[PDB]
Amino acid sequence: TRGRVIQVMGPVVDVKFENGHLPAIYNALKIQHKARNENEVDIDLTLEVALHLGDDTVRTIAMASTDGLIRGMEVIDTGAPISVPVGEVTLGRVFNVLGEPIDLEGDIPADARRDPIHRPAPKFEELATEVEILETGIKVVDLLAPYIKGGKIGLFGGAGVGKTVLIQELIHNIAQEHGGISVFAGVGERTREGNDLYHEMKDSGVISKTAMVFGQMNEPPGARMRVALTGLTMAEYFRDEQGQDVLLFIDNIFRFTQAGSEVSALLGRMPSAVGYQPTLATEMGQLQERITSTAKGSITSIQAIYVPADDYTDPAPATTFSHLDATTNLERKLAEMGIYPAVDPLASTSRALAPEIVGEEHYQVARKVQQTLQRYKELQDIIAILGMDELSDEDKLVVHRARRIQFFLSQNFHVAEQFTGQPGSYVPVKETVRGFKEILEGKYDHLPEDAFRLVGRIEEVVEKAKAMGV
């Protein structure tokens, strides 16, 4: 019926039950205690079962601080894993790991629908047999690093390159075109940046189509390693019930794995290489296999990854890099010169850039642009600098078209219209292929470079140069 506390060693607790009444693994248990005198404090705690040790004892991990616990307290078995609310009631609100609102707009009614946090991955016979391309509406992404429905993308960048603007633009474009929602999960990051993102999303207006879950540095190891699953189960409902295409953003996947190690040794497990838990790839696989493209809808996830000390051979980045399909690199150099977004065109990679996926025309145009940019990068540095400038023919034209193509990858976003009068554009992929091909052929070689700046389709560029006096 009810268990009692045996040991309290940090974030790990031991509970003893009656014979033949042990809870299953992954269940949730509750401690609710009121002080009986001045030598006691009130307790409201949730625990998750981890191991069966034998002799009617189980070892559990706490979801909050364990200060104030007493050997002999009474524990209640809930009967099921952690359950979070799902549906339209979670749109525009902020939750914690247990599925409780941390804003001040009220509580979800107890007569709602709640889904468990742990479930198996979709089976082989109900996956997508074809690779499909996701239409974002950006120009550099849709040309040099296309995204995939149900894929995983690694976003590389930090401060001063503006990745929150890219996040908001993706949310807005996907919601407007494909009618999808977004879920943001912050896993063990700074609280200041979470507040900043919440207020930016409130200002833009993309909050009403997003659900936010936060578990950050201040929280125990147990809460940091079970918060991505709450966002995942909030997102899966829309794919499996409304048949939508959803986006899932993860603030730091690395922290997830890190949190696991912080409890592994306390559970009584021998260490593996570099002091990591023996069950590392299994945990990462059980997480990342639940986001796929089934026959109804799809979940595509953008994940930000921090590499410790820029060491890419560390077990955690090495394990998580085998699940990624594309990478998107944001560079400060392009942000200084006024290219928005600051996506690096020569360092962004994708596995969808192949003639059998996008097409022959797309592939040829993209490869021509890439080699032109590489030629510019090689030539402009060792030559034309240090007083070795020269004006060879076919080198005037190469830099002419390269400069006219580098500035056409910039775009005007809808979320940036609050600081700038331009409404913003959504450019399909055929249009940008046509525009880049036309620029490559030299048809638009008789215009100044200022016309190719913060513009959508190629034709609009002409109108710009019409009003510039040229």
Binding site: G10, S65, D67, V94, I102, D103, L104, A159, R190, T191, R192, G194, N195, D196, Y198, H199, F214, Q216, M217, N218, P220, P221, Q258, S261, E262, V263, S264, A265, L266, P271, V274, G275, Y306, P308, A309, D311, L386, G387
Partner: protein
């Protein structure tokens, strides 16, 4: 030995940090008095800026200058010393008392002979004393003399309690120990009261290796770094700040408008000089640019215990950024810096007052005029 302390309230050492809904974005500036910090790596109220370096460099000098420079403002300071000689703590307290800085300062100390538990619990006691003022409407600043000694004390405690070791024998939860502490510094919202708490942790490296375990653990928690180097210490750059690797993620929003307008040009030209310095016939502009860089390197350095009010700072910065120094040789640059300020001691005072009262640049023409006058009254060596 000055008698007991007459207090009435107590606070728990372990408390939870403010949530996402309780905070506000950082906008107010924290003035340190060092031109390099106030210009290239600004620090705002409610931020956590890490100072990382080596034993040779004077991190404690930076901390003591920052604490002294808070005399006019309304801010309480707390100095926490972990694993230091008691003699050095007494010298620091004497330096503080001489400058009249003990009207608003609390010192918490745990010397090297004390048992490890006190060294492990000192920072939490310091931040708990700060949170009493934070949750009333006041602004506090907290300095941690060294966190790499708290880490060693914690490791010793855990090993003696027979808990499994990890990397370099450190316990498993060595990131939690510091993140749980440094997340208690916040800028509260208007409904909470509007108070704040700033934190300035110190970290020491061995042979200038910042890829180590604890430096990387604490680098990924704070909102920027201030990296001090030893090869720049002996090259004449006495503040020794490596502006190539120092950063401030709040930067820009923690400045006044006058400094926002001027610091970007300094960042740009110093970056260009250091980027094109490595390969240094040469192009006609190139050498000039190099000279500009040199002038900047001469104008950033300053002596010890010489705080400069922000007005004067922006002034000289402007006087540099538009090339007005190009008519004076590099070896004389510092002398210019000495003679400009005193020239404003009796001239252009209104200018200063305006900069103090509207936090914006005054009528540019007038500034130029004054500069010209001063130049007329300057003798080139």
């Amino acid at each position: 030995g000055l008698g007991p302390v007459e207090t009435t309230e107590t606070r728990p050492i372990e408390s939870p940090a403010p949530g996402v809904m309780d905070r506000r974005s950082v906008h107010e500036p924290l003035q340190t008095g060092i031109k390099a910090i106030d210009a290239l790596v600004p620090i705002g109220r409610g931020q956590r800026e890490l100072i990382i370096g080596d034993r040779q460099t004077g991190k404690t000098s930076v901390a003591i200058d920052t604490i002294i420079n808070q005399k006019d403002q309304n801010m309480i300071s707390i100095y926490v010393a972990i694993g230091q000689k008691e003699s050095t703590v007494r010298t620091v307290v004497e330096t503080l008392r001489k400058h009249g800085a003990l009207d608003y300062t609390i010192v918490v100390t745990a010397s090297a002979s004390q048992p490890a538990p006190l060294l492990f619990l000192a920072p939490y006691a310091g931040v708990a004393m700060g949170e009493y003022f934070m949750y009333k409407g006041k602004h506090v600043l907290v300095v941690y003399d060294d966190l790499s000694k708290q880490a060693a004390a914690y490791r010793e405690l855990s090993l003696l309690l027979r808990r499994p070791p990890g990397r370099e024998a450190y316990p498993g939860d060595i990131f939690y120990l510091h993140s749980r502490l440094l997340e208690r510094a916040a800028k509260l919202s208007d409904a909470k009261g509007g108070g704040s708490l700033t934190a300035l942790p110190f970290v020491e490296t061995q042979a200038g290796d910042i890829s180590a375990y604890i430096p990387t653990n604490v680098i990924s928690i704070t909102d920027g770094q201030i990296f001090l180097q030893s090869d720049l210490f002996f090259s004449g750059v006495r503040p020794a700040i490596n502006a190539g690797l120092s950063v401030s993620r709040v930067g820009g929003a923690a400045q006044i408008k006058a400094m926002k307008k001027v610091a970007g040009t300094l960042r740009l030209d110093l970056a260009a000089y250091r980027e094109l310095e490595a390969f240094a016939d040469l192009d006609k502009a190139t050498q000039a640019k190099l000279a500009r860089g040199a002038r900047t390197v001469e104008v950033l350095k300053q002596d010890l215990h010489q705080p400069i009010p922000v007005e004067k700072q922006v002034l000289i910065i402007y006087a540099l950024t538009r090339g007005f120094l190009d008519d004076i040789p590099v070896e004389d640059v510092r002398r210019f810096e000495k003679e400009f300020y005193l020239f404003l001691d009796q001239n252009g005072q209104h200018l200063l007052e305006h900069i103090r009262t509207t936090k914006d640049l005054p009528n540019e023409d007038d500034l130029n005029k004054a500069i010209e006058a001063f130049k007329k009254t300057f003798v080139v060596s």
